[PDB]
């Protein structure tokens, strides 16, 4: 049965992708400090297989951790575009979510979803390190629900 | 569709060229096989390709225009080209060596079925081979892009937008003025 | 008063000069640094087992917003708009009118959770403890629109979290 | 034949893994993805421009010193000679001269990188 | 003392109802410590404590395998903890709801719900106010 | 706190310190998470008499700046020269 | 790899804070100061609170002033840990960052217990502080403080006498006392060159 | 706890054990239960090639004793 | 029967490398007061598999400006040469017995440098170029010292055959008579394998990712696999050189147990060292080797030429 095989193969690739998420070393402002706290010993994101890597070529997730200005917007789009696929974006904190407390500023992008597609929105100013860790686990369960090969099979 | 929905606006484009097209990109990707096979060298085919943004604007303007109901439009580009010149132009813009050679329909229809074995997206099919070599009809009775307030964008102004990524590093920076336009057909 | 962090004259007697010679050639101060990371290898790590274990919080924690009721089930909010006035981020939007009875109540009460800075000024400003920041911090969503809370969402939050919220207010209201 | 088989197997397996890596994943190629990386902003000038070498003098010296090891490698075999008086002198003579050149380049500031 | 260490390890297998239960928790929660059961909530979650563990690890929950019709044997998240145990688990208080029950209100949810984002029962925003301008309606009869 | 004797000796020796006396993980020495209720004091203005606000109104005592010169003897400095600092008796040299 | 010119292009985090503040009351503008040097949140609050108190011609009460100094020094620990460990991390010494952010994690707990927020407390306000210390908090601060000096020693055992660390830091970025003054430097950027200046000593507050 | 690192070390150790064990056993199997002959120098190769001829089965590792003298 | 032997070499190497990544993450984790991978499989045992599968189903990228042929060649060469470094290693029997096995490894190690040089150059990117030229500088720093150190040790062994090092150390480890060489050798292998505190060609905190900044997915994995395979190989080489294991011909597996333990512990020290020190500046690496190791290595080479002659302890040529 092809249906059974592709179903299992999705489980395999989905499990590999969510079990080895490598976020880009990318942070913008306050919220990057809570992201550093998620890497710190108490939460130790690395114990989930979540490893920071600097190069976009070697990254799977962009955590937009902080305010996106108009001056920084092209640069953020550049490094997102340079990520190989599949790639995911986590929007962290009010600034990245929808502009936050600089929403009405002339120099601030009102939400990073104007620039990149966003998979998970993590609320808070800043979200606690645990709130971000909850967001990463929510992304893992989203990846676990992907049906790429099942959809390919039925095309 | 016309009987089922008599007020439908039906739009009949030629081949649409653009960044994600399967037209200009299709020709440029033939380089991976060396030479470019063309039925009768592509001298017995005329295309009138149309720009994606022109088609999009035509669709948007048809939604707002009340005249577009129950009408049929033909969205064509501003110039007609022989297939040989068009494919030659593609390789000139991409700065790739162009080595055309005739291939008969039966032999080239046989290559299409070969590639049809792919369980994924076929690189080419027999149907695609026929469509590429079908001369683009002339339908004066139908309204066109100009009837929707759209100026058809010439191929020469947007090919580099599509074909720059097919160049090697040596030729990436070449500007829009380096390649001579292909011969058209008045 | 001040002190010098790095103003030393090293000893030049033979013993001190040989102790530095051994240090340079035998890497003694580098070995000492290996001992310290070795000593951490054998310590118990500080990692907790999230989500089975949670980081400690206090009753003052500022999390997800909720609109509260009186014990009778009446809304506490009276549409005074003090929370809307003080909101540093202009994240609250309110409309109000006389209810079908004579009551002063809101018809719109929105919080743009992507404008909010979770500062808690709204619950400080509220005269009737109607709007609070609750203890919930695990409400990340897949879409932006899910973070634009209207009055129905906030009343549901209060009904969902009142048991914990009331106990947290009970622990902290004498500090307020 | 054993060695050539081992070399052929090693590089074949490496080539096979590259082939899988390029033909198994789903590709999505466009201009912005494949542009050169430089921290989010477009590079200023080409990466083929000259890159100054500040250790140029050490690199040339490496050539002369690398040939010394070719001259010193046979020493374990040279120790089997009956004529041990001559080899020991010449073995020590070569090393001392290698040490002398290092001392000369060191004192003349050849090991310091240019500014 | 090494043998004493290994006996504590073996006592963990028995403390988890045999090797099957031991493997169940090891694969569900990636931890096999045995704690004192503090209580269970109506959704099946079980709450444990061990006050000789350092602050932060001295309390924990073993999530229920099924909650609200959803299979949570492998898929668990922090939003499955109901409010009464939320306070105890996050150390906002010392007293579990078994000892210090919460105040009962008619309007409080009887059935807690986890995070519903990404499902058909997710929250969708909308304006809660009614139309502000009434448009004139022309007469339904001709007269002209 | 649960480390065996041998491991305690090994890691104490490796670091050169007595680690057990100053453990970086918290145990029972920290405060209870349930505390008795406070009863906070009141400030000095909580009086029923002799408490007229006009006599304790800081804002209304602020005055507009004093004009020294408008464009309408011994030399001075902005303040006396700063006294020289002294070395710590606690530990003059780190 | 020799640097001939450094041209810092900033403004990639410019969010018009100073224009936004003009549309806020003095209370509403305070949280903007948490988000400036977002590693020294309460110190930023205090600077603003002192300025508004000075214009109001009021004085915060002694207990608030003592709480401000206490949490100002707690904040200095949070900042200096970040400053030293990320600096060490950039130079390739990654391990001390982890040891010390578990201490930083314990200090966010003090922030959260007085304000309910780990970072942007908005706790120090013109007139004093928002709320009083919860009972049992000073006991916990004392427990934390009693062990921290040992953590600093562990940091020093990794870096201070490390010949690799000294090679990377000794004689790097020398600034003369005269240049530091004219270039507008302050704080450790002045005291590193021998200048004897500290506003807590020369122009004390609270 | 630090001993949770051991399972990875043990798995790495068993992997690094296999090449050394496999080469030894394969050499015994391919050389009639003995160590593979080492021929670093031409003399040792000469003796090997003689043993290949002397064997009678074209195998340098099949050795003939006093039963092969008459 | 030789092809089976080849596979019983390559396959364990790759699996050992994969689980070295897990061990490194755990050891760094615990030395940093955290745990490291412990969710993906029990004790994080499946983490290496997830990383491997994930990387090979990730889209690979050919940069628009890169030189395609050398861009693809370089990662192939890195892994191919990494596996070739193992064929002469006696554990206790080599796959390929070589008279000059020591020299073969010097040649293959020098050739493996070009996988850094050509990957970095072929990328046509500034951070990749800077990383590549750091590889030139780092090779210039260590190779001259590295080969002369081997020569000093082999003056006691008597040949370039790797199996003879076992015989030389039947009564005693060579680390006793040559601990000054063992120290300078151990540091050299850290620079040889581009390991901290000499992790300069990738130099993450300075060059983002250095020579392999443009590599993704499978091609990136090959460089990672090659890098970790050389960590193990050069610590095995160190164990053979200085911590010789006794070989019982009738129970070779006893050798492989003791030999494996020593090589593992040496490999752990690479992780231990990475967790403990900051990074050299790459000009300071050159001056470390040329102004400290080289003067002492030259002096010790003279000493180890003379010492066998003056003590009448010259080793046999065979
Ligand atoms: C290849 C190498 C691997 C193969 C050998 C495997 C060795 C046996 C592993 C057993 C470890 C688990 C012990 C146990 O019962 O679990 C306790 C634990 C309950 O105990 P606990 O109360 O939580 O804490 C125990 C101590 O109080 C808190 O922990 P502790 O820090 O106090 O240590 C206790 C104990 C833990 O250690 C062991 O028991 C095993 C020692 C093996 C050492 C090998 C190196 O160690 C000792 O008692 C001291 C002697 C141990 C040797 C110390 C040598 C140090 C190295 C020398 C210093 C210089 C280094 C350079 O139960 C478990 O969780 C079991 C989980 C399974 C762990 C994995 C075990 C299998 C490892 C892989 C096997 C091969 C595949
Ligand atoms: C195992 C071998 C691994 C390397 C395999 C190389 C092919 C990689 C696949 C590939 O080339 O990408 C697609 C590539 C086409 O990509 P493209 O960007 O559209 O075309 C760019 C140009 O071809 C321009 O591409 P290009 O810049 O890479 O130039 C091609 C080639 C230049 O090649 C030539 O111009 C003529 C052939 C000379 C190379 C032959 C040896 C040269 C002298 C050494 C003698 C060696 C004898 C042994 O460049 C080389 O020098 C490669 C030398 C490799 C030597 C391997 C060691 C022997 O090739 C094809 O698919 C056809
Ligand atoms: C090539 C061979 C590699 C096969 C490895 C398969 C991984 C096994 C696995 O999924 O781990 C258990 C996982 C564990 O489930 P999990 O990843 O959802 O656990 C979530 C995390 N905890 C448990 C801590 C809350 O099982 C699965 O997720 C099902 C996927 C099976 C993979 C498809 C096999 C075909
Ligand atoms: C150290 C060595 C480790 C090597 C590990 C090698 C990998 C081992 C694990 C293999 C698992 C199976 C691999 C399937 C991955 C296919 C990639 C993919 O998801 O593409 C989805 C694609 C999706 O196809 P699609 O046609 O539905 O949509 C893609 C087209 N666009 C972009 C327009 C939407 O499916 C396939 O390509 C075919 C899947 C067939 C499975 C074989
Ligand atoms: C009877 C006759 C006998 C004749 C022979 C007698 C001679 C015996 C004594 C000779 C001296 C023995 C030591 C020689 C080894 C080389 C020593 C050396 O050069 O170290 C100094 C070097 C320079 O550093 P620095 O201090 O900054 O500069 C000095 C002034 N310019 O600094 C360094 O090299 C530091 C290197 C930094 C990186 C270190 C990272 C790893 C540290 C832990 C390694 C532990 C060693 C384990 C070895 C394993 C063995 C297999
Ligand atoms: C730029 C892109 C490069 C990409 C990398 C490509 C792979 C390169 C691999 C390295 C090439 C150099 C190979 C050198 C091998 C030398 C090894 C050696 O000398 O020993 C092997 C053996 C001699 O054994 P020995 O003990 O010395 O004497 C015989 C006693 N029985 O002698 C033999 O076993 C016979 C071997 C003969 C075949 C030699 C073929 C060399 C091909 C070069 C390519
Ligand atoms: C400051 C620390 C710096 C760290 C730098 C890294 C250095 C790590 C060195 C790791 C290797 C240490 C040695 C480990 C000993 C392994 C013990 C073993 O498994 O075998 C037992 C062995 C004795 O057996 P054997 O070596 O065969 O006898 C010698 C005759 N040739 O051994 C007998 O006891
Ligand atoms: C036969 C084998 C053993 C022989 C050793 C061969 C190597 C000899 C090394 C050169 C010795 C003399 O050459 C060298 O000259 C310079 C003067 O610029 C000396 O001094 C200079 O260099 C050293 C180190 O760089 C600096 O700390 C010092 O500030 C500077 O004055 C060196 O200390 C000395 O080493
Ligand atoms: S969301 Fe809050 S904490 Fe995060 S960057 Fe913006 S202001 Fe700072
Ligand atoms: S917490 Fe602050 S920003 Fe959020 S709604 Fe309340 S007052 Fe506004
Ligand atoms: S929530 Fe409170 S402050 Fe806001 S309008 Fe209602 S009663 Fe007023």
From Swiss-Prot, chain E:
Topological type in the membrane: Peripheral membrane protein
Highest taxon above the source species: Eukaryota
One Pfam family in the UniProt entry: NDUFA12
Subcellular location: Mitochondrion inner membrane
GO CC annotations, alphabetized: mitochondrial inner membrane; mitochondrion; respiratory chain complex I
Keywords (A to Z) from UniProt: Acetylation, Electron transport, Membrane, Mitochondrion, Mitochondrion inner membrane, Respiratory chain, Transport
Physiological role: Accessory subunit of the mitochondrial membrane respiratory chain NADH dehydrogenase (Complex I), that is believed not to be involved in catalysis. Complex I functions in the transfer of electrons from NADH to the respiratory chain. The immediate electron acceptor for the enzyme is believed to be ubiquinone.
Name listed for the protein in its UniProt record: NADH dehydrogenase [ubiquinone] 1 alpha subcomplex subunit 12
Organism (species): Bos taurus (Bovine)
Swiss-Prot record, chain F:
Pfam families referenced in this protein's UniProt entry, alphabetically: CI-B14_5a
Keyword annotations from UniProtKB, A to Z: Acetylation, Electron transport, Membrane, Mitochondrion, Mitochondrion inner membrane, Respiratory chain, Transport
Subcellular location: Mitochondrion inner membrane
Residues recorded with modification N6-acetyllysine: 39
Main location as per UniProt: mitochondrion
Location of the region described as Disordered in the Swiss-Prot/TrEMBL record: 31-51, 73-94
Positions of modified residues (N-acetylalanine): 1
Membrane topology recorded in Swiss-Prot or TrEMBL: Peripheral membrane protein
Listed transmembrane segments: none
Keyword 4Fe-4S: no
GO biological process, one term: mitochondrial electron transport, NADH to ubiquinone
Molecular-function GO terms, alphabetical: oxidoreductase activity
Any Gene Ontology CC annotation: mitochondrion
Chain's role: Accessory subunit of the mitochondrial membrane respiratory chain NADH dehydrogenase (Complex I), that is believed not to be involved in catalysis. Complex I functions in the transfer of electrons from NADH to the respiratory chain. The immediate electron acceptor for the enzyme is believed to be ubiquinone.
Family, similarity comment: Belongs to the complex I NDUFA7 subunit family.
PANTHER family in alphabetical order: NADH DEHYDROGENASE [UBIQUINONE] 1 ALPHA SUBCOMPLEX SUBUNIT 7, NADH-UBIQUINONE OXIDOREDUCTASE SUBUNIT B
Subunit-level organization: Complex I is composed of 45 different subunits.
Name of the protein described by the UniProt record: NADH dehydrogenase [ubiquinone] 1 alpha subcomplex subunit 7
Source species of the chain: Bos taurus (Bovine)
Gene name as annotated: NDUFA7
From Swiss-Prot, chain H:
InterPro entries found in the cross-reference section: NADH_Ub_cplx-1_asu_su-1
Identification of the protein by name: NADH dehydrogenase [ubiquinone] 1 alpha subcomplex subunit 1
Subunit structure, as described in the record: Complex I is composed of 45 different subunits.
Keyword list, A-Z: Electron transport, Membrane, Mitochondrion, Mitochondrion inner membrane, Respiratory chain, Transmembrane, Transmembrane helix, Transport
Subcellular location: Mitochondrion inner membrane
Family the entry assigns: Belongs to the complex I NDUFA1 subunit family.
Transmembrane segments: 1-21
Topology of the protein relative to the lipid bilayer: Single-pass membrane protein
The keyword Transmembrane helix is assigned to this record: yes
Keyword Mitochondrion (UniProt): yes
Gene Ontology cellular component annotations, sorted alphabetically: mitochondrial inner membrane; mitochondrion; respiratory chain complex I
From Swiss-Prot, chain I:
InterPro entries: NADH_UbQ_OxRdtase_su1/FPO, NADH_UbQ_OxRdtase_su1_CS
EC number: 7.1.1.2
Reactions listed under catalytic activity: a ubiquinone + NADH + 5 H(+)(in) = a ubiquinol + NAD(+) + 4 H(+)(out)
Protein name: NADH-ubiquinone oxidoreductase chain 1
Keywords on record: Electron transport, Formylation, Membrane, Mitochondrion, Mitochondrion inner membrane, NAD, Respiratory chain, Translocase, Transmembrane, Transmembrane helix, Transport, Ubiquinone
Subunit (UniProt): Core subunit of respiratory chain NADH dehydrogenase (Complex I) which is composed of 45 different subunits.
Lineage: Eukaryota, Metazoa, Chordata, Craniata, Vertebrata
Membrane topology: Multi-pass membrane protein
UniProt modified residues of type N-formylmethionine: 1
Gene, per the UniProt record: MT-ND1
Subcellular location(s) per record: Mitochondrion inner membrane
Organism of provenance: Bos taurus
């Amino acid at each position: 049965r092809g249906e059974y095989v592709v179903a299992k193969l999705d489980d395999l690739i989905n499990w590999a992708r969510r079990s080895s998420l490598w976020p880009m070393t990318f942070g913008l402002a306050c919220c990057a400090v809570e992201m550093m706290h998620m890497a710190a010993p108490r939460y130790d994101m690395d114990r989930f297989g979540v490893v920071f890597r600097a190069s976009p070529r070697q990254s799977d997730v962009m955590i937009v951790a902080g305010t996106l200005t108009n001056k920084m917007a092209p640069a953020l789009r550049k490094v997102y575009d340079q990520m190989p696929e599949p790639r995911y974006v986590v929007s962290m904190g009010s600034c990245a979510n929808g502009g936050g407390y600089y929403h009405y500023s002339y120099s601030v992008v009102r939400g990073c979803d104007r620039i990149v597609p966003v998979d998970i929105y993590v609320p808070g100013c800043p979200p606690t390190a645990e709130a971000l860790l909850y967001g990463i686990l929510q992304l893992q369960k989203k990846i676990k629900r992907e049906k790429r090969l099942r959809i390919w099979y039925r095309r | 569709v016309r009987e089922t929905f008599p007020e439908a606006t039906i739009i009949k484009p030629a081949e649409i060229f653009g960044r994600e097209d399967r037209f200009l990109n299709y020709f440029a990707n033939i380089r991976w096989f060396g030479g470019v096979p063309l039925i009768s060298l592509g001298k017995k085919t005329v295309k009138q390709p149309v720009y994606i943004v022109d088609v999009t604007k035509g669709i948007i303007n048809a939604i707002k225009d009340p005249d577009a109901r129950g009408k049929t439009f033909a969205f064509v580009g501003p110039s007609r080209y022989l297939l040989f010149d068009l494919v030659q132009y593609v390789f000139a813009v991409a700065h790739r060596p162009f080595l055309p050679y005739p291939l008969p329909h039966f032999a080239y229809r046989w290559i299409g079925r070969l590639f049809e074995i792919s369980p994924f997206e076929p690189w080419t099919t027999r149907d695609k081979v026929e469509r590429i070599h079908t001369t683009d009809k002339i339908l004066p009775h139908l309204p066109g892009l100009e009837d929707l307030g759209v100026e058809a964008t010439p191929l020469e102004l947007k090919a580099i937008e599509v074909l720059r990524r097919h160049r090697t590093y040596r030729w990436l920076s070449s500007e829009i003025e380096d390649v001579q336009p292909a011969k058209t057909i008045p | 008063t001040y002190k010098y962090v790095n103003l030393r004259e090293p000893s030049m007697d033979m013993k001190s000069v040989t102790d530095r010679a051994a240090q340079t050639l035998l890497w003694t101060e580098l070995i000492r640094g290996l001992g310290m990371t070795l000593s951490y290898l054998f310590r118990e790590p500080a990692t907790i087992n999230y989500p089975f274990e949670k980081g400690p919080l206090s009753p003052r924690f500022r999390g997800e917003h909720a609109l509260r009721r009186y014990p009778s089930g009446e809304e506490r909010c009276i549409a005074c708009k003090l929370c809307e006035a003080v909101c540093p981020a202009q994240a609250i939007t309110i409309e109000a009118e006389p209810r079908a009875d004579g009551s002063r109540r809101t018809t719109r009460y929105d919080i743009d959770m992507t404008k909010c800075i979770y500062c808690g000024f709204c619950q400080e400003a509220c005269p009737v403890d109607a709007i609070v920041e609750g203890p919930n911090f695990e409400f990340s969503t897949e879409t932006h629109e899910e973070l634009l809370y209207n009055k129905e969402k906030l009343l549901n939050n209060g009904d969902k979290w009142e048991a914990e919220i009331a106990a947290n207010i009970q622990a902290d209201y004498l500090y307020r | 034949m054993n060695l050539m088989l081992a070399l052929l197997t090693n590089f074949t397996l490496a080539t096979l893994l590259v082939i899988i890596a390029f033909w198994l994943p789903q590709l999505n190629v466009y201009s912005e993805k494949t542009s050169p990386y430089e921290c989010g902003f477009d590079p200023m000038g080409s990466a083929r421009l000259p890159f100054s070498m500040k250790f140029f003098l050490v690199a040339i010296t490496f050539l002369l010193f690398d040939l010394e090891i070719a001259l010193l490698l046979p020493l374990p075999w040279a120790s089997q000679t009956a004529n041990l008086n001559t080899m020991l002198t010449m073995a020590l003579f070569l090393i001392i001269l290698l040490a002398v050149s290092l001392a000369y380049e060191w004192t003349q500031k050849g090991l310091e990188w240019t500014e | 003392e090494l043998l004493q260490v290994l006996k504590r390890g073996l006592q963990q297998v028995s403390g988890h109802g045999g090797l099957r239960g031991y493997l169940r928790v090891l694969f569900r929660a990636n931890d096999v410590r045995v704690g004192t059961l503090v209580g269970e909530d109506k959704y099946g979650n079980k709450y444990y404590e061990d006050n000789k563990q350092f602050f932060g690890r001295h309390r924990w929950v073993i999530y229920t395998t099924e909650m609200n019709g959803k299979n949570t044997f492998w898929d668990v998240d922090g939003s499955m903890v109901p409010p009464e145990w939320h306070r105890w688990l996050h150390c906002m208080t010392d007293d579990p709801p078994t000892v210090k029950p919460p105040t009962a209100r008619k309007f409080i949810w009887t059935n807690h719900k986890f995070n519903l984002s990404g499902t058909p029962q997710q929250y969708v925003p909308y304006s809660t106010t009614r139309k502000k301008i009434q448009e004139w309606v022309p007469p339904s009869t001709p007269y002209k | 706190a649960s480390a065996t004797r041998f491991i305690q000796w090994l890691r104490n020796w490796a670091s050169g310190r007595d680690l057990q006396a100053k453990l970086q993980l918290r145990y029972q020495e920290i405060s209870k998470r349930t505390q008795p209720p406070p009863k906070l004091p009141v400030g000095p203005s909580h009086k029923l008499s002799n408490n007229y606000y006009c006599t304790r109104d800081g804002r209304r005592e602020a005055m507009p700046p004093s004009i020294v010169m408008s464009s309408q003897k011994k030399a001075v400095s902005p303040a006396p020269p700063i006294k020289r600092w002294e070395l710590s008796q606690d530990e003059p040299y780190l | 790899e020799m640097v001939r010119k450094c041209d810092p292009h900033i403004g990639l985090l410019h969010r018009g804070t100073e224009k936004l503040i003009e549309y806020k009351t003095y209370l509403q503008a305070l949280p903007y100061f948490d988000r400036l040097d977002y590693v020294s949140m309460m110190c930023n609050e205090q600077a603003y609170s002192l300025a508004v108190e000075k214009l109001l011609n009021i004085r915060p009460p002694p207990r608030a002033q003592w709480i401000r100094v206490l949490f100002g020094e707690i904040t200095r620990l949070l900042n200096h840990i970040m400053a030293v460990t990320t600096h060490a991390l950039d130079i390739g010494a990654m391990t001390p960052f982890f040891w010390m952010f578990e201490e930083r994690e314990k200090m966010f707990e003090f922030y959260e217990r007085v304000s309910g927020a780990r970072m942007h407390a908005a706790y120090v306000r013109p007139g004093g502080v928002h709320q009083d210390l919860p009972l049992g908090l000073m006991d916990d601060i004392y427990e934390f403080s009693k062990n921290f000096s040992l953590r600093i020693d562990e940091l020093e055992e990794m870096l201070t006498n490390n010949r690799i660390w000294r090679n990377r830091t000794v004689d790097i970025g020398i600034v003369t006392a005269e240049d530091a003054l004219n270039y507008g430097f302050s704080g450790v950027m002045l005291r590193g060159s021998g200048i004897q200046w500290d506003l807590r000593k020369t122009q004390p507050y609270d | 706890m630090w001993f949770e690192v051991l399972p990875g070390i043990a798995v790495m150790g068993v992997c690094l054990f296999i090449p050394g064990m496999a080469t030894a056993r394969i050499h015994r199997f391919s050389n009639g239960g003995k160590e593979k002959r080492v021929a670093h120098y031409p003399y040792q190769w000469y003796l090997m090639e003689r043993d290949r001829r002397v064997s009678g089965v074209n195998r340098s590792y099949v050795s003939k004793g006093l039963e092969n003298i008459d | 029967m030789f092809m089976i032997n080849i596979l019983m070499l390559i396959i364990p190497i790759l699996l050992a490398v994969a689980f070295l990544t897990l061990v490194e993450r755990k050891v760094l984790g615990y030395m940093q007061l955290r745990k490291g991978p412990n969710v993906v499989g029990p004790y994080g045992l499946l983490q290496p598999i997830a990383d491997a599968i994930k990387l090979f189903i990730k889209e690979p990228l050919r940069p628009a400006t890169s030189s395609a042929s050398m861009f693809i060649l370089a990662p192939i060469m890195a892994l191919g040469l990494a596996l070739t470094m193992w064929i002469p290693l006696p554990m206790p029997y080599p796959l390929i017995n070589m008279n000059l096995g020591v020299l073969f490894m010097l040649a293959m190690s020098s050739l493996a440098v070009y996988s850094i040089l050509w990957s970095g150059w072929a990328s046509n990117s500034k951070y990749a170029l800077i990383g590549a030229l750091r590889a030139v500088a780092q090779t210039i720093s260590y190779e001259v010292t590295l080969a002369i150190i081997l020569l000093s040790v082999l003056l006691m062994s008597g040949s370039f055959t790797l199996s003879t090092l076992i015989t030389t150390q039947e009564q005693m480890w060579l680390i006793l008579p040559a601990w000054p060489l063992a120290m300078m050798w151990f540091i050299s292998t850290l620079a040889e394998t581009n390991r901290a505190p000499f992790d300069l060609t990738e130099g993450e905190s300075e060059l983002v990712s250095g020579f392999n900044v443009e590599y993704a997915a499978g091609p990136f994995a090959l460089f990672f696999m090659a890098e970790y395979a050389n960590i193990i190989m050069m610590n095995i080489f160190t164990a053979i050189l200085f911590l010789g294991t006794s070989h019982n011909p009738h129970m070779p597996e006893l050798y492989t147990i003791n030999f494996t333990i020593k090589s593992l512990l040496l490999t752990m020290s690479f992780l231990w060292i990475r967790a403990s020190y900051p990074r050299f500046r790459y000009d300071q690496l050159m001056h470390l080797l040329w102004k400290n190791f080289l003067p002492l290595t030259l002096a010790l080479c003279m000493w180890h030429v003379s010492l066998p002659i003056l003590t009448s302890g010259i080793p046999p040529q065979t």
